[PDB]
Amino acid sequence: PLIVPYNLPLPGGVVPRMLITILGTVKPNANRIALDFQRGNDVAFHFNPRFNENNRRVIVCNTKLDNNWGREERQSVFPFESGKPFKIQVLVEPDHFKVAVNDAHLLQYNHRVKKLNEISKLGISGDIDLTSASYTMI
Numbered sequence: 634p635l636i637v638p639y640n641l642p643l644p645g646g647v648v649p650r651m652l653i654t655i656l657g658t659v660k661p662n663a664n665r666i667a668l669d670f671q672r673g674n675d676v677a678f679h680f681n682p683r684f685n686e687n688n689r690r691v692i693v694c695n696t697k698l699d700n701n702w703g704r705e706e707r708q709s710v711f712p713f714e715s716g717k718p719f720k721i722q723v724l725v726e727p728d729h730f731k732v733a734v735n736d737a738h739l740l741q742y743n744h745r746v747k748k749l750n751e752i753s754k755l756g757i758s759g760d761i762d763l764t765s766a767s768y769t770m771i
């Protein structure tokens with residue numbers, strides 16, 4: 634029953650084997666969801682499911698450096714559904730963010746921001762009811 638947009642501090646930044654778990658429910662008639670792993674004003678990893686882009690479902694991933702978005706990485710496999718509960722797991726690897734949704738691997742995102750310890754906040758926003766957001770070391 635948390636509040637969106639939600640800020641989850643990541644003390645000391647991210648590190649390989651860190652597992653971030655977000656539990657929530659997609660709102661009815663949802664338009665978009667966004668996870669933003671931030672390094673100061675930069676966004677190291679933007680994870681952005683879009684429910685209506687040209688009447689398609691798509692997940693857009695990108696990095697924002699000095700107020701400029703970079704080249705998008707798109708995943709057409711779309712495991713979110715309006716009205717339904719979800720679990721997003723982000724596993725930090727040495728070279729990638731690894732994303733699984735509802736216990737099924739979804740995508741990996743190669744680190745463009747390479748100072749992982751400086752990625753110290755996770756912003757959670759968009760059309761969801763947020764149930765929980767936490768992290769653990771596996």
Ligand SMILES: OC[C@H]1O[C@@H](S[C@@H]2O[C@H](CO)[C@H](O)[C@H](n3cc(-c4cccc(F)c4)nn3)[C@H]2O)[C@H](O)[C@@H](n2cc(-c3cccc(F)c3)nn2)[C@H]1O
Pocket residue numbers: 665666667679681693694695702703705707758759760
């Ligand atoms: O990069 C990610 C960002 O993108 C722009 S939209 C973007 O604008 C560009 C022009 O400036 C391009 O038109 C781009 N594009 C690429 C392609 C394409 C590329 C390759 C192949 C192919 F076929 C098609 N088509 N169009 C658009 O996606 C969003 O505003 C932004 N954002 C999202 C949010 C946000 C805020 C609150 C909640 C939330 F969920 C998200 N707050 N900022 C963020 O998600």
